[PDB]
């Protein structure tokens, strides 16, 4: 005896998060974030909007000191910045001090493959530096400056904390971004004499406990960008009281005629994203199957008809919540479908020389008045 | 909350075991739908497989066998290469792509006495010779800009058993049976065009036919069931 | 005998709308475009 079962679920394979919209943003603690430019100049602009005004440049190759009016907050500003390579760009940094502050010159980097990413760690901003061969990193004095609010200006790419070394893998070489790439006769043998066998009716009180198992799983994001709402199937052991004789039995569950949707609430890495939500409707079909001990049940194969008169069930639902550290959680709450008995079905699977079995009941379903 | 019973309704008959042998081949072909999401030029939704029945015709020993044949693939894993963000990017829902995780469910039917005879089956064994399954090539229409193409898939197919199923209505009974295969990952790869991530193994879900005739494998069968036959009564004292 | 068997059956139909990015864009023929904004002052902007 044994189950027999139909599902494949696999989403949690993108490794990469996407490109996003430009857009001022309130960027969370301790996360890694990537830059992808497109023209070299201004990148993002993220101030302490009380006392420190940040960001940095990009620059073309083959370029001699020259200042240059740029209109950060609406106003220019002007710095000498000069090249030395022929094939290279180069990575600065710039502090501001008010309105009308000063210039803080930093940031040092030898850019081959146009692409960044400097962020923040333990209250204090990391900075990187170097050239592909062995460039490393370094950090500027933050001293807790972790109300900044960048402003994003092109298109780019998240990263979260414990994989440091893949994305310094990639600062130093990059994604691949190639997009368009390119017999003899027929016997019949007897195995031995003949056989007497005769048929029987059995019809016994059928008792069966159900209940069903359910996994929820996170997807990699920001906290609500999820997709995978799994099923899964139930096994359990019973006890019944027949006849003076105990019973006991197995049971699992499966359904089929999946009614999924999906909540794509906007495209901020902060909205509410959701990508498979399954709830079922009345078209869709419910599997169990039985691995009983009775002597009645113990002598079913070779059957010529099973017919089964089964009491229509109620199935309710309930309530779930989650967990992103902002605004209002949402909450999930619904559920209810009546069962009704369906066809009865019977497969048998064969190996070697040995066979299983499985009685598979399906179940016709409908949905109830009260709404949700 | 009644009592239990057991009740009889025949008497005693004769039955005998019997082995069956035929040389057999099968006709083997997929089948696909492209629902594409609503939108303005850049939309795909889902790329998967459906059933289909097929008729076909074969000889041995010079009869005639008229086939019926249908397809499905269990397992199948999906995967959704995100195309970006912007009102142009190729945003797409689902796609279908297999591994040898994956299994196939397909069903097989015939005419001859052999499949109306065995219905009481004990053991159904089979030798089906390994066959090889390829890709070709599916394009896209867009509103501005290059075209791409799907394109490129092989496997291997390794026999994994057989199943029988029987559906029991209020009214009649339905037979059924089906085929379970292992799938084995070959060189080629899918030659999927405008995007980065590319040079995968398995195969896709557009171009299953590949302009290909259909598809062919051959075996044996190994059956026992029981049936009717002749009384013993005649050499009581032998 | 007879067909008898269900795979799956996905049916997935969320999309009667859909939310986009405010940046730039350039308007094809024969389409419409759904704009509500909660801030006042000037958000559409076109420009030939």
């Given at each position: 005896?044994?189950?027999?079962?139909?599902?494949?679920?696999?989403?949690?394979?993108?490794?990469?998060?996407?490109?996003?919209?430009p857009t001022?943003?309130?960027?969370?603690?301790?996360?890694?974030?990537?830059?992808?430019?497109?023209?070299?100049?201004?990148?993002?602009?993220?101030t302490?909007n009380?006392?420190?005004?940040?960001?940095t440049?990009?620059?073309?190759?083959?370029v001699?000191?020259?200042?240059?009016?740029?209109?950060?907050?609406?106003?220019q500003?002007?710095?000498?910045?000069?090249?030395?390579?022929?094939?290279?760009?180069?990575?600065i940094?710039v502090?501001?001090t008010?309105?009308?502050?000063?210039?803080?010159?930093?940031?040092?980097?030898?850019?081959?493959?146009?692409?960044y990413?400097?962020?923040?760690?333990?209250?204090?901003?990391?900075?990187?530096?170097?050239?592909?061969?062995?460039?490393?990193?370094?950090?500027?004095?933050?001293?807790?400056?972790?109300?900044?609010?960048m402003?994003?200006?092109?298109d780019?790419?998240?990263?979260?904390?414990?994989?440091?070394?893949?994305?310094?893998?990639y600062?130093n070489?990059?994604?691949?971004?190639?997009?368009?790439?390119?017999?003899?006769?027929?016997e019949?043998?007897?195995?031995?004499?003949?056989?007497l066998?005769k048929?029987?009716?059995?019809?016994?009180?059928?008792?069966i406990?159900?209940?069903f198992?359910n996994?929820?799983?996170?997807s990699?994001?920001?906290?609500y960008?999820?997709?995978?709402?799994?099923?899964?199937?139930?096994?359990?052991?019973?006890?019944?009281?027949?006849d003076?004789?105990?019973?006991?039995a197995?049971?699992?569950?499966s359904?089929?005629?999946?009614?999924?949707?999906?909540?794509?609430?906007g495209?901020?890495?902060?909205?509410?994203?959701?990508?498979?939500?399954?709830?079922?409707?009345?078209n869709?079909y419910?599997?169990?199957?039985?691995?009983?001990?009775?002597?009645?049940f113990?002598?079913?194969?070779?059957v010529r008809?099973?017919?089964?008169n089964?009491?229509?069930v109620?199935?309710?639902?309930?309530?779930?919540?989650?967990?992103?550290?902002?605004?209002?959680?949402?909450?999930?709450?619904?559920?209810?479908?009546?069962l009704?008995s369906?066809?009865?079905?019977?497969?048998?699977?064969?190996?070697?020389?040995?066979?299983?079995?499985?009685?598979?009941?399906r179940?016709?379903?409908?949905?109830?008045?009260?709404?949700? | 909350a009644?009592a239990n019973?057991?009740?009889?309704i025949?008497?005693?008959?004769?039955?005998?075991?019997?082995?069956?042998?035929?040389?057999?081949?099968?006709?083997?072909?997929?089948?696909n739908?492209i629902?594409?999401?609503?939108?303005?030029?850049?939309?795909?939704?889902?790329i998967?497989?459906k059933?289909?029945?097929?008729?076909?015709?074969?000889?041995?020993?010079?009869?005639?066998?008229?086939?019926?044949?249908?397809?499905?693939?269990?397992?199948?894993?999906?995967?959704?290469?995100?195309?970006?963000?912007?009102?142009?990017?190729?945003?797409?829902?689902?796609?279908?792509?297999?591994?040898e995780?994956?299994?196939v469910y397909?069903?097989?039917?015939?005419?001859?006495?052999?499949?109306?005879?065995?219905?009481?089956?004990?053991?159904?064994?089979?030798?089906?010779?390994?066959?090889?399954?390829?890709?070709?090539?599916?394009?896209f229409?867009?509103?501005?800009?290059?075209?791409?193409?799907?394109?490129?898939?092989?496997?291997?197919?390794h026999s994994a058993?057989?199943?029988?199923?029987?559906?029991?209505?209020?009214?009649?009974?339905?037979?059924?049976?089906?085929?379970?295969?292992?799938?084995?990952?070959?060189?080629?790869?899918?030659?999927?065009?405008?995007?980065?991530?590319?040079?995968?193994?398995?195969?896709?879900?557009?171009?299953?036919?590949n302009?290909?005739?259909?598809y062919?494998?051959?075996?044996?069968?190994?059956?026992?069931?029981?049936?009717?036959?002749?009384?013993?009564?005649?050499?009581?004292?032998?």
């Amino acid at each position: 005896w044994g189950p027999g079962e139909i599902n494949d679920s696999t989403t949690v394979e993108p490794l990469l998060d996407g490109p996003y919209q430009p857009t001022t943003f309130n960027p969370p603690v301790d996360y890694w974030m990537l830059l992808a430019p497109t023209t070299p100049g201004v990148i993002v602009e993220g101030t302490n909007n009380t006392d420190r005004w940040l960001a940095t440049i990009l620059i073309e190759p083959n370029v001699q000191s020259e200042n240059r009016t740029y209109t950060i907050f609406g106003i220019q500003e002007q710095l000498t910045v000069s090249n030395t390579s022929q094939d290279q760009w180069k990575f600065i940094d710039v502090v501001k001090t008010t309105a009308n502050g000063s210039i803080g010159q930093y940031g040092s980097l030898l850019s081959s493959p146009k692409l960044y990413a400097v962020m923040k760690h333990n209250e204090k901003l990391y900075t990187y530096e170097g050239q592909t061969p062995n460039a490393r990193t370094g950090h500027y004095s933050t001293t807790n400056y972790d109300s900044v609010n960048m402003t994003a200006f092109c298109d780019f790419y998240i990263i979260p904390r414990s994989e440091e070394s893949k994305c310094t893998e990639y600062i130093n070489n990059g994604l691949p971004p190639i997009q368009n790439t390119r017999a003899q006769a027929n016997e019949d043998i007897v195995i031995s004499k003949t056989s007497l066998w005769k048929e029987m009716q059995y019809n016994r009180d059928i008792t069966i406990r159900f209940k069903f198992a359910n996994t929820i799983i996170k997807s990699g994001g920001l906290g609500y960008k999820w997709s995978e709402i799994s099923f899964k199937p139930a096994n359990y052991q019973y006890t019944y009281t027949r006849d003076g004789e105990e019973v006991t039995a197995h049971t699992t569950c499966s359904v089929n005629g999946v009614n999924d949707f999906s909540f794509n609430g906007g495209s901020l890495p902060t909205d509410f994203v959701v990508s498979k939500f399954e709830v079922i409707k009345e078209n869709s079909y419910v599997y169990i199957d039985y691995w009983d001990d009775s002597q009645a049940f113990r002598n079913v194969v070779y059957v010529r008809s099973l017919a089964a008169n089964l009491n229509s069930v109620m199935c309710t639902g309930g309530s779930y919540n989650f967990s992103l550290p902002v605004g209002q959680w949402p909450v999930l709450t619904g559920g209810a479908v009546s069962l009704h008995s369906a066809g009865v079905t019977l497969s048998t699977q064969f190996t070697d020389f040995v066979s299983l079995n499985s009685l598979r009941f399906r179940f016709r379903l409908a949905v109830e008045e009260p709404h949700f | 909350a009644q009592a239990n019973e057991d009740i009889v309704i025949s008497k005693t008959s004769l039955w005998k075991e019997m082995q069956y042998n035929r040389d057999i081949t099968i006709r083997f072909k997929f089948a696909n739908t492209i629902i594409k999401s609503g939108g303005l030029g850049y939309k795909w939704s889902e790329i998967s497989f459906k059933p289909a029945n097929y008729q076909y015709t074969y000889t041995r020993d010079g009869e005639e066998v008229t086939a019926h044949t249908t397809c499905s693939v269990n397992g199948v894993n999906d995967f959704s290469f995100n195309g970006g963000s912007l009102p142009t990017d190729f945003v797409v829902s689902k796609f279908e792509v297999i591994k040898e995780n994956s299994y196939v469910y397909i069903d097989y039917w015939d005419d001859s006495q052999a499949f109306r005879n065995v219905v009481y089956v004990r053991s159904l064994a089979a030798n089906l010779n390994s066959v090889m399954c390829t890709g070709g090539s599916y394009n896209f229409s867009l509103p501005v800009g290059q075209w791409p193409v799907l394109t490129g898939g092989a496997v291997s197919l390794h026999s994994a058993g057989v199943t029988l199923s029987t559906q029991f209505t209020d009214f009649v009974s339905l037979n059924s049976l089906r085929f379970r295969f292992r799938l084995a990952v070959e060189e080629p790869h899918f030659k999927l065009t405008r995007t980065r991530l590319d040079r995968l193994y398995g195969l896709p879900a557009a171009d299953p036919n590949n302009g290909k005739e259909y598809y062919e494998i051959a075996g044996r069968f190994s059956l026992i069931s029981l049936v009717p036959s002749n009384d013993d009564y005649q050499t009581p004292i032998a």
